[PDB]
Enzyme design. Structure first.
Site, PDB file in Angstrom:
ATOM      1  N   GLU A 193     -36.965 -23.564  -5.597  1.00 49.63           N
ATOM      2  CA  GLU A 193     -36.636 -24.768  -6.351  1.00 49.63           C
ATOM      3  C   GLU A 193     -35.328 -24.649  -7.097  1.00 49.63           C
ATOM      4  OE1 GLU A 193     -38.065 -27.722  -6.552  1.00 49.63           O
ATOM      5  OE2 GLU A 193     -36.475 -28.212  -8.218  1.00 49.63           O
ATOM      6  N   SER A 202     -36.929 -33.501  -6.222  1.00 49.14           N
ATOM      7  CA  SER A 202     -36.215 -32.311  -6.688  1.00 49.14           C
ATOM      8  C   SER A 202     -34.877 -32.083  -5.989  1.00 49.14           C
ATOM      9  CB  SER A 202     -36.998 -31.036  -6.451  1.00 49.14           C
ATOM     10  OG  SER A 202     -38.162 -31.160  -7.326  1.00 49.14           O
ATOM     11  N   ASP A 247     -43.151 -36.478  -6.487  1.00 48.92           N
ATOM     12  CA  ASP A 247     -43.337 -36.265  -5.065  1.00 48.92           C
ATOM     13  C   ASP A 247     -44.687 -36.756  -4.571  1.00 48.92           C
ATOM     14  OD1 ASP A 247     -40.838 -35.009  -5.158  1.00 48.92           O
ATOM     15  OD2 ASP A 247     -41.656 -32.981  -4.771  1.00 48.92           O
ATOM     16  N   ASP A 293     -31.903 -26.795  -6.446  1.00 50.19           N
ATOM     17  CA  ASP A 293     -31.197 -27.484  -7.506  1.00 50.19           C
ATOM     18  C   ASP A 293     -29.741 -27.098  -7.543  1.00 50.19           C
ATOM     19  OD1 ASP A 293     -33.833 -28.273  -7.999  1.00 50.19           O
ATOM     20  OD2 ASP A 293     -33.994 -27.150  -9.899  1.00 50.19           O
TER      21      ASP A 293
END
Ligand SMILES: [Ca+2]
Ligand SMILES: [Cl-]
Length: 369
Positions: free
Chosen positions: A79, A286, A169, A83
């Protein structure tokens, strides 16, 4: 029309019409993480080196206790990789500095995360901060997290900082055990539902054979093998009142409507990201939020970091100036016939849609923001 495929993060400027804008070399960007980023920094080096880019100046910040747990969350590295690589790609390959505001993992409740937000605001060094995280707003409200964190985001907005927050999500089913179909029962995520952040939803991105933008539909990839829905978060807060700039979307409740804007989120059209050294194709809201963050940081660098919290300006500018966006018109963010539908102008799955950055930049040059 167009093709669904994965994309290198360095493609996002072409896709969203940002190539003619400055890079974010003059803007500092933050990323909120849960725990450490040691593998993520190695993956970032793989990213910049593979793409022939200058290395990115980074800092990592322990935002809570000295004795806290800032070890890497192994799954979490992917993650923070999504990003950081998506920000730097969208930014045109350069940011002034990337600051990782790491939440303590051994703190009570949600206080580690709250302290990470707090540190980013108190330091007031990052102009734009990515938050590719969230959960049922009703849970955040029930334990006081919502109230504590909203105070921090309010300070951010007043200081001229932009927090960008993924809408979720789970489609409309955020609060039903994080995305299990629940008929007509709809809910939204925190912190996306704060009126003090920019909430970013998700699209399915189609490109032409030459790699140009073709079209976007709502992100909705249906159920996984567990029966969980994967789709863009969108709806309205049950708690937060409507900020007055949202009044331009008539026929909606007196609540904070979300998302504000949207970018690529479908896994099937997602980003190619280095994660523990291996390239993976990753989506989610995300992804969409870091795309916005990198693009917005370009506009900040074009404007001497003088653009304040932009929500009111987005709603006035886009409502009056439809050429500033790619208006998503097709798809839904539920299951089984339920959920919200995209449509002309602002809608619950996608908000205003995606930004056309060069057109927005020209608008800002003429009109301010
Ligand atoms: Ca629309
Ligand atoms: Cl407000």
């Amino acid at each position: 029309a167009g093709t669904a495929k994965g994309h290198n993060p360095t493609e996002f400027p072409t896709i969203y019409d940002a190539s003619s804008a400055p890079t974010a070399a003059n803007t500092t960007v933050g990323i909120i993480t849960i725990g450490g980023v040691s593998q993520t920094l190695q993956d970032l080096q793989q990213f910049t080196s593979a793409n022939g880019l200058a290395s990115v100046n980074t800092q990592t910040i322990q935002t809570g206790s000295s004795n806290g747990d800032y070890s890497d969350d192994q799954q979490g590295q992917g993650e923070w990789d999504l990003d950081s690589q998506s920000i730097v790609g969208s930014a045109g390959g350069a940011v002034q500095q990337l600051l990782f505001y790491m939440a303590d993992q051994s703190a009570s409740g949600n206080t580690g995360l709250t302290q990470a937000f707090n540190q980013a605001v108190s330091d007031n060094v990052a102009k734009v901060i990515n938050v590719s995280l969230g959960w049922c707003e009703a849970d955040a409200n029930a334990d006081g997290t919502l109230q504590a964190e909203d105070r921090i985001f309010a300070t951010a907005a007043a200081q001229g900082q932009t927090f960008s927050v993924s809408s979720g999500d789970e489609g409309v089913y955020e609060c039903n055990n994080r995305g299990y179909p629940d008929g007509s029962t709809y809910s939204v995520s925190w912190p996306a539902s704060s009126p003090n952040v920019i909430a970013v939803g998700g699209t399915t991105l189609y490109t032409t054979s030459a790699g140009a933008y073709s079209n976007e539909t709502v992100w909705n990839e249906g159920l996984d093998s567990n029966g969980k829905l994967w789709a863009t978060g969108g709806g309205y807060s049950v708690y937060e009142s409507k900020p007055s700039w949202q009044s331009v979307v008539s026929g909606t409740p007196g609540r904070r409507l979300l998302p504000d804007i949207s970018f690529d989120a479908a896994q099937g059209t997602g980003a190619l990201i280095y994660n523990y050294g291996q390239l993976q194709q990753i989506g989610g809201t995300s992804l969409a939020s870091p795309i916005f963050v990198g693009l917005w940081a370009r506009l900040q660098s074009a404007n001497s970091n003088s653009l304040g919290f932009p929500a009111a300006s987005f709603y006035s500018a886009i409502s009056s100036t439809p050429s500033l966006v790619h208006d998503v018109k097709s798809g839904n963010n539920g299951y089984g016939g339920y959920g919200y539908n995209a449509g002309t102008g602002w809608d619950y799955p996608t908000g205003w849609g995606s930004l056309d950055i060069a057109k927005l930049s020209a608008y800002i040059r003429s009109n301010g923001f």
